Swiss-Prot record:
Coiled coil: none annotated. Disulfide bonds join C6-C127, C30-C115, C64-C80, C76-C94. Substrate binds at D101. CDD domains: LYZ_C (cd16897). Its main location: secreted. It is an enzyme of class 3 (hydrolase). This is Lysozyme C. Monomer. Its EC number is 3.2.1.17.
Length: 129
């Protein structure tokens, strides 16, 4: 499913992401925009053989099981495919773990390079939240 900006903003909030670990909702929507263009089915293969899945492009090296990333962890305790669903619950659950990992949102390279320090409030303007 391809989310609309405000639709996703509302789905995210509803799931406890606004100010989760001090990150306002604008940061989460900005991250999803640049990571997958709001497409839950996005996938991208990395050079190390790991793959990034879903709306937040969660990596198979540490967070999910795809059965094809030799000696990787499954910290979120889910099959990576669960991250591609129309329902964003697993993606958000896993994201909460990642963001709590120590590096905050710096864990997402597009956030770091495209959202960090920009007017993220722009991503939620005009939405009914």
């Amino acid at each position: 499913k391809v989310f609309g900006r405000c639709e996703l903003a509302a789905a995210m909030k509803r799931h406890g992401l606004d100010n989760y670990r001090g990150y306002s909702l604008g940061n989460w929507v900005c991250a999803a925009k640049f990571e997958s263009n709001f497409n839950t089915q996005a996938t991208n293969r990395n050079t190390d053989g790991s793959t990034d899945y879903g709306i937040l492009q969660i990596n198979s090296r540490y967070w999910c099981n795809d059965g094809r990333t030799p000696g990787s962890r499954n910290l979120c305790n889910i099959p990576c495919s669960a991250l591609l669903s129309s329902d964003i619950t697993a993606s958000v659950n896993c994201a909460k773990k990642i963001v709590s990992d120590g590096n905050g949102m710096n864990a997402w390279v597009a956030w770091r390079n495209r959202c960090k320090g920009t007017d993220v409030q722009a991503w939620i303007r005009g939405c009914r939240l």
